[PDB]
């Protein structure tokens, strides 16, 4: 397991910037956001080739230790052996993951927490920089 | 304040922390090590705290026990402004680079093969954390 950050006081509107390195042999990587490891309002999992998925982003929530229903997208703006930057924010309705080029993924806010307190990276993704602004 | 785990910061690698020092700051803390009980560096600039003023306080914590405290004479921090600190370590010392060109060494007393844990506290709002 990779970088774990807690006591982030990320309130609605505030923006979490993460820059990291995608491994050359990347099958998938994971960015987890929420209250703690059992309460995730966003499980952001780009799968190059993993768990039956190829070049597909799988988003989900985890509520009280229980996974929710997976949501899949068409576009896949990630490539192995490269640098990936995401800007993440949320409001009462959705979590939004923005990519520099203009890509924008919305995931429904299923947990409705006051803040994002927890971030964890996993899989083939080496976090290089985290910024709160 | 912010807590980071599984940093896996190896010797020679550099940890960059940028933050916002409160206008009425009394003190803030950067803790580095294995966990809250095992700190190879307790970095504690004191503006107006524990009877001290404009003093950089450093110490270690080994198995819950504070080590022998040390202090630097300079103080390149100024409340109500942005401050950046860069930390690295070898087997002998931790090297802390301060904003205004200043740099000092704190003896490596914990014999860890990596820094895996960081905790911020006090009047210091972290804005950026970088690893390389
Ligand atoms: C059988 O379908 C597959 O089920 C697995 C599973 O372990 O249940 C799914 O993989 C997990 O997905 C969650 C998020 O929902 C998380 O990413 C875990 O790390 C995965 O192990 C998988 O999505 C699913 N595959 C399909 C239906 O394509
Ligand atoms: C006179 O000794 C003083 O003891 C206090 C104490 O509470 O034990 C010291 O304050 C602590 O310092 C450690 C690091 O050394 C850490 O910062 C704690 O948060 C503080 O409570 C104080 O530094 C010390 N004064 C001296 C030795 O000048």
How far apart are the CA of B50 and the centre of ligand 2, in A?
Answer: 7
Question: CB neighbours of B2 closer than 8 A, spacing ≥ 6?
Answer: A5, A6, A7, A8, B118, B119, B120, B126, B129
| B122–chain A nearest CA distance, Å | 13
Inter-CA distances, B16 with A82, B119, B126, Å: 22, 13, 11
CATH code of the domain covering residue B43: 2.60.120.200
How far apart are the CA of B56 and the centre of ligand 2, in A?
Answer: 12
Is the separation of the CB atoms in A8 and A119 below 8 Å? Answer: yes
Phi and psi dihedrals of A128, rounded to 5? -110, -30
Chain B residues close to A133, C-beta within 8 Å: 127
CA-CA distance, B84 to A110, in Å (whole number)? 37
What burial letters (b/e) apply to A71-95, b meaning 16+ CB within 10 Å? eeeeeeebeeeeebebbbbbeeeeb
| B46–chain A nearest CA distance, Å | 23
**CB atoms A129 and B129 under 8 Å:** yes
For residue A10, the cross-strand partners are A116
Experimental method: X-ray
CA nearest ligand 2 atom 6, residue:
B50
CA-CA distance, A6 to A117, in Å (whole number)? 6
What burial letters (b/e) apply to B85-107, b meaning 16+ CB within 10 Å? bbbbbeeeebbbebeeeeebebe
Task: Give the domain range for residue A129.
Answer: 1-133
> Largest Cα–Cα distance of chain B, in whole Å?
37
Is the separation of the CB atoms in B120 and B32 below 8 Å? Answer: no
Q: Give every strand in the sheet of B15-21, ordered side by side.
A: A104-108, A94-98, A83-90, A16-22, A125-132, B124-131, B15-21, B82-89, B93-97, B103-107
| A74–chain B nearest CA distance, Å | 32
CA-CA distance, A73 to B5, in Å (whole number)? 31
Residues near ligand 1 (Cβ within 6 A): A 43, 45, 51-53, 58, 60, 67, 70
Residue ranges at the known binding site of B: 42-46, 50, 59, 66-69
Between CA B49 and CA A21, with CA B93 as vertex, the angle to 5 degrees is 95
**CB atoms A1 and B6 under 8 Å:** yes
CA-CA distance, B18 to A133, in Å (whole number)? 12
Phi and psi dihedrals of B10, rounded to 5? -80, 160
Place of tokens 């993704």: A125
Q: Which residue does chain A place closest to B5, by CA atoms?
A: A4
**CB atoms A5 and B1 under 8 Å:** no
Question: CB neighbours of B84 closer than 8 A, spacing ≥ 6?
Answer: B16, B17, B18, B19, B99
Q: Record the resolution, in angstroms.
A: 2.2
Domain count, chain A: 1
What's the sign of the alpha-carbon dihedral B121, B56, B27, B129?
A: negative
Q: Which residue does chain B place closest to A2, by CA atoms?
A: B6
Ligand lying closest to the C-alpha of residue B28: 2
Is the separation of the CB atoms in A117 and A4 below 8 Å? Answer: no
Residue B28 burial (CB count, 10 A): 24
Q: Residue A90: which of A15, A7, A39, A5 has the closest Cα?
A: A15
Is the separation of the CB atoms in A76 and A57 below 8 Å? Answer: yes
What is the SS3 string spanning chain B? CCEEEEEEECCCCCEEEEEEECCCCCEEEEEEEEECCEEEEEEEEECCECCECCEEEEEEEECCEECCCEEECCCCCCCCCEEEEEEEECCCEEEEECCCCCEEEEECCCCCCCEEEEEEEECEEEEEEEEC
Residue B31 burial (CB count, 10 A): 21
């Amino acid at each position: 397991c990779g970088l774990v950050a807690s006591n982030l006081n990320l309130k609605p509107g505030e923006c979490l910037r993460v820059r990291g390195e995608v491994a050359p042999d990347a099958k998938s990587f994971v960015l987890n956001l929420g209250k703690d490891s059992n309460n995730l309002c966003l499980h952001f999992n780009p799968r190059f080739n993993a768990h039956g998925d190829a070049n597909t982003i799988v988003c989900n929530s985890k509520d009280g230790g229980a996974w929710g229903t997976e949501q899949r997208e068409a576009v896949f703006p990630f490539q192995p052996g490269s640098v990936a930057e995401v800007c993440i924010t949320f409001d009462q309705a959705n979590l939004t993951v923005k990519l520099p080029d203009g890509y924008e993924f919305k995931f429904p806010n299923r947990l409705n927490l006051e803040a994002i307190n927890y971030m964890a990276a996993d899989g083939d993704f080496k976090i290089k920089c985290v910024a709160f602004d």
